Structure 1
């Protein structure tokens, strides 16, 4: 089972923290969006367009369940995986690290806001706020550790997670005595 499953909004650091945490632990890194494309030979966009969001979520859930069973390192989850009740069920018992971010920081870290085509319509920042409103309660539900990334740099985020993921060695005493 994974040492940590990372969840959070776009820009929260799933890729950056995934890589740095996996490096610090000396473990493998799997990202579920990448794994979907690798397992299907279809792009994420193509699956959504052709099959619809529900079938995307079906394929995603199967990939997530496989990774939770088979992967021993760091796993990062696609943003929408937690919308599936079956993914939330599958996660229970795992170490699930929710990388928290504000809307303004998430917008900044994903390339900034956009032009607002109509005064009466949304911009990117508003769409992001909506995503946050729908997703954040689900990440809070599934989490076993929550880490604020707004004012911690990646190294500080990784140190914070590491400090809460420690594994005592049952062979510690014998290693001092000999090994």
Structure 2
């Protein structure tokens, strides 16, 4: 089945990468709501926040979500896409949601902050769980997660 697949998780969990790798395996399209926002508005999140604050950033993010959602597409979402209940509902409704979970220690170690990742997870862990259909060990290699997800979700390859 071809419902949109939303990858959620905190900063450092490998959403874009795994998201892009899963899309390839399934023959889907791939879109990252942070990247889309940047390359369509011209603005960074610091640009958006400085001009309209976190509330205007959050609104714009919700709008991106609705804009990019479509079948045969994997969507990587920003880390705080799960703060707004309306966003959490939209994802379970339109598609299937996958949470890439990694403990703060390991989220911190990913740098291509451990106290900040710890507090992000105190706030959001529960929202990640609430919104997810499937939860997968994000500390594996991307290819391995793609494989595990095709098995768990029962998705055929391209």
Check conservation: 2:82, 2:127, Cα contact below 8 A: yes
Equivalent residue, structure 2, for 1:166: 154
Question: RCO greater where, 1 or 2, for CA within 8 Å and sep 6 or more?
Answer: 2
* Segment drifting more, 1-10 vs 21-30: 1-10
Aligned-residue offset at 1:92: 2.2
Residues 127-177 of structure 1, C-alpha deviations (whole Å, 9 max, x = no match): 111111111110100000000123x22221111101123357xxxxxxxxx
Equivalent residue, structure 2, for 1:86: 86
Please give the alpha-carbon distance, in whole angstroms, between the structure 1 residues aligned to 2:16 and 2:26. Answer: 15
Which consecutive segments of 4 or more residues in structure 1 shift more than 3 A? none
TM-score, structure 2 as length reference: 0.89
Aligned mate of 2:127, from 117, 130, 138: 138
Aligned-residue offset at 1:125: 1.4
Whether 1:37 aligns to 2:38 is yes
Aligned mate of 1:156, from 140, 144, 147: 144
Counterpart secondary structure, 2:82? helix
Counterpart secondary structure, 1:42? coil
Equivalent residue, structure 1, for 2:24: 23
Question: What is the root-mean-square deviation in Å for CA atoms of aligned residues?
Answer: 1.7
TM-score, structure 1 as length reference: 0.79
Please give the alpha-carbon distance, in whole angstroms, between the structure 2 residues aligned to 1:135 and 1:143. Answer: 12
Which stretches in structure 2 are left out of the alignment for 5+ residues?
none
Check conservation: 1:10, 1:110, Cα contact below 8 A: no
